[PDB]
Design a protein around this ligand. Structure first.
Ligand code: MN
Ligand code: MN
Ligand code: MN
Ligand code: MN
Lengths: 58, 399, 398
């Protein structure tokens, strides 16, 4: 059973603080770090200019 | 159910698959999409079961240099499914940089601040896709740099190998994942002989690490050192994902001598017409809780069906008489009947599966020992051109 | 003036083309130059808070890029495109029409899964045009990755409808017309047959800055082996000609068609030609209302190229065809010229550490008049460790 043993838990002088997300149930366990950023028009009906809105140039 | 209770905050749900050989026979007219559709099905199953993460056994791309279409299809599928919003409820305790040193972004994909990873993909490069070139790069490197697949288990040094683990913790459960990329069998055998293989273990909570190992090496012995004996590995390893062997034995099996289990998920596509390939393909959902484990095999509904049968003419002297001038005609008749029965079974099975491919694969192995003469395979196969996926490989004569 | 132009209603576009990424990769001396230049341009983009890059095509030199080339391209794009910088402009066109061939038909950043900070728009240049029954190109791979939005594809070859992508930021708006590279003769025939059309928005028709990128030969290399500028219509405001590698990034007014044409030129010296000699640049094109402003920025990592032609017949005093030693005098003069070239190269290099150490050289010699060429290899031996292309330092022609 015994083999090479090396302290692998990554704890520096200050132990690593796991990341989290708003607690949806109890204390939700999330460690992701993605947050899609907003762009203009977000949450707004798109003002799309297509189909008949475009005209061939004569 | 018992499985539902076993699905808790402290239970890992690892989906296991191997040897997708994506893009295999891509240029084929009939089998062209088999690999792609199979990958779609496996990823969809991963999503539906809400798996904590995927652990692919290697050989992800059939060719060492995947063709453009293959890479595009794989990448779009991964982006479509594995990118999402469902929370990931496990955390990494190891030194990520050590595990993924060869990547300029040394951290697990879902920890990237810019990618919305939902279903992280872990894998280990297989024989067909091992790093190559002076740069020593592989397709999994392309995907990883793109930010989809976490490529782990790389070997920094050829003289000596230090298989460091990635420590995955979910609640009270912890896992030590030990992956060893595909290495040529003779060399790895010799290195094991020379005591050049070492496995690091965490000094902390030593007994509390379900030691999970993955390898891509031949399991059967085809030569003096043209394989890897199980006896080499140590008993502290809890579960082993033997991947390279395409035949499926997904059911975990205990090694009495070594006291650890060995799982052979097998290929996700029938790359060859061999008896091992005939077994129904499956993909394993592994559950880990504490020091215990459980494996549940899931059928694939898109894997093109393979039916094989070995017929020995000499074992039917009543039916086959070599002296009989018309023995060849009777042989053809019986082979035709057997192939009809195989197709009947294939259609019967397919009836319940819509997505299943329509034309299954069939190979009849004929032992013509005893003076029996093989006949024109081409002319016989002419009659099943529209029925089977291997019209040119319906029968096989051997002695 | 530039600061005043830099407003919430002002676009900030970085334009470059013919990156020819990875070309001559395997070489020891210039192998890494392409990646260094790509890093330089991306870093310039990220430093000047550019709204979006508009690569003119040929983003990969080889139709099927090498594993290393693709890996490094993805690496750099990840390091310098993904971030927390918000994108401050908006799409107004119907997206699926433009990126329909992708299973995710929308501008990459509009996808929720990816944190794009600096969008990349491009077209497909000749060397990386779609090929195979699948009609996919490396830029399609990057698109699927969600890094580069490959726009301007043409579904049919018999008819072409260049649907613009409409981009607005504050008050200012842009119509971006991207026509991918096409075989020149075929495109010429299509223009002659009136099969070419460029759709326009009915709304505020005159308020849309019509910007049209194209990758085609400019100079007349044949009867129909190029694209006369007269084919374009005057409603187009600015044209970014991409294929030609001579850098002419200074906008030029064509008195006839009343449209500006800017030629960013390649970012790396692919071939030894006089046009390649000019110093390369990258344009921080700005747009506001119907007025535009292009400001060039030199690249500190493009391998230096010095070129000069020498007509021996033009120096009768120095060289006499009847002189038996004429070969040696010619060789001495060539050595002196090359030494002066190297001196100037080092002089200019001294001001930028990043610049490549071994400058490139190509000396064209017009040996007409009964003169004979001398050994190229023997003469070039003296600089094998001094110039980046020692095997071809001199060119003899008549
Ligand atoms: Mn395999
Ligand atoms: Mn294998
Ligand atoms: Mn070019
Ligand atoms: Mn070109």
């Amino acid at each position: 059973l015994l083999t090479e043993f090396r302290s692998l838990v990554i704890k520096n002088s200050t132990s690593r603080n796991p990341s989290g997300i708003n607690d949806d149930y109890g204390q939700l366990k999330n460690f992701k770090k993605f947050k899609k950023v907003t762009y203009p028009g977000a949450g707004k009906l798109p003002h799309i200019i297509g189909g008949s809105d475009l005209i061939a140039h004569h | 159910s018992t499985a539902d209770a076993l699905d808790d905050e402290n239970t890992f749900k690892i989906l296991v698959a191997t040897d997708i050989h994506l893009g295999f026979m891509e240029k084929d007219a009939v089998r062209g999409n088999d690999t792609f559709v199979t990958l779609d099905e496996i990823l969809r199953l991963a999503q539906e079961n809400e798996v904590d993460f995927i652990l692919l056994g290697g050989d992800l791309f059939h060719e060492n240099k995947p063709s453009r279409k293959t890479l595009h299809t794989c990448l779009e599928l991964l982006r479509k499914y594995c990118m999402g919003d469902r929370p990931v409820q496990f955390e990494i305790l190891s030194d990520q940089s050590v595990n993924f040193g060869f990547s300029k972004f040394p951290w697990v994909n879902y920890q990237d601040g810019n990618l919305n990873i939902s279903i992280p993909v872990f894998s280990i490069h297989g024989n067909n896709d091992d790093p190559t070139g002076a740069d020593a790069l592989c397709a999994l490197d392309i995907l990883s740099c793109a930010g989809f697949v976490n490529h782990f288990g790389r070997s920094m040094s050829v003289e000596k190998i230090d298989i460091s683990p990635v420590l995955l913790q979910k609640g009270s459960t912890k896992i030590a994942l030990y992956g060893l990329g595909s290495i040529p069998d003779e060399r790895l055998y010799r290195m094991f002989v020379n005591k050049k293989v070492t496995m690091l273990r965490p000094k902390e909570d030593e007994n509390s690490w379900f030691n999970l190992f993955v390898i891509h090496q031949n399991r059967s012995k085809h030569g003096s050192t043209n394989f890897i004996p199980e006896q080499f590995l140590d008993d502290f390893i809890d579960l082993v994902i033997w991947g390279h062997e395409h035949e499926c034995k997904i059911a975990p099996t205990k090694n009495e001598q070594q006291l650890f289990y060995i799982s052979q998920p097998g290929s996700s596509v029938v790359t060859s017409l061999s008896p091992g390939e005939a077994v129904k393909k499956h993909v394993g959902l592994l559950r880990i809780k504490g020091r215990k484990m459980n494996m549940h095999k899931i059928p694939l509904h898109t894997v093109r069906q393979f039916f094989m049968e070995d017929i020995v003419l000499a074992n039917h002297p009543d039916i086959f008489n070599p002296d009989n001038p018309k023995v060849t005609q009777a042989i053809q008749s019986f082979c035709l009947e057997k192939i009809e029965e195989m197709l009947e079974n294939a259609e019967r099975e397919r009836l319940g599966n819509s997505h299943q491919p329509e034309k299954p694969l069939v190979r009849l192995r004929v032992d013509y020992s005893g003076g029996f003469e093989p006949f024109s395979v081409l002319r016989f196969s002419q009659k099943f051109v529209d029925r089977v996926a291997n019209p040119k490989d319906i029968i096989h004569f051997f002695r």
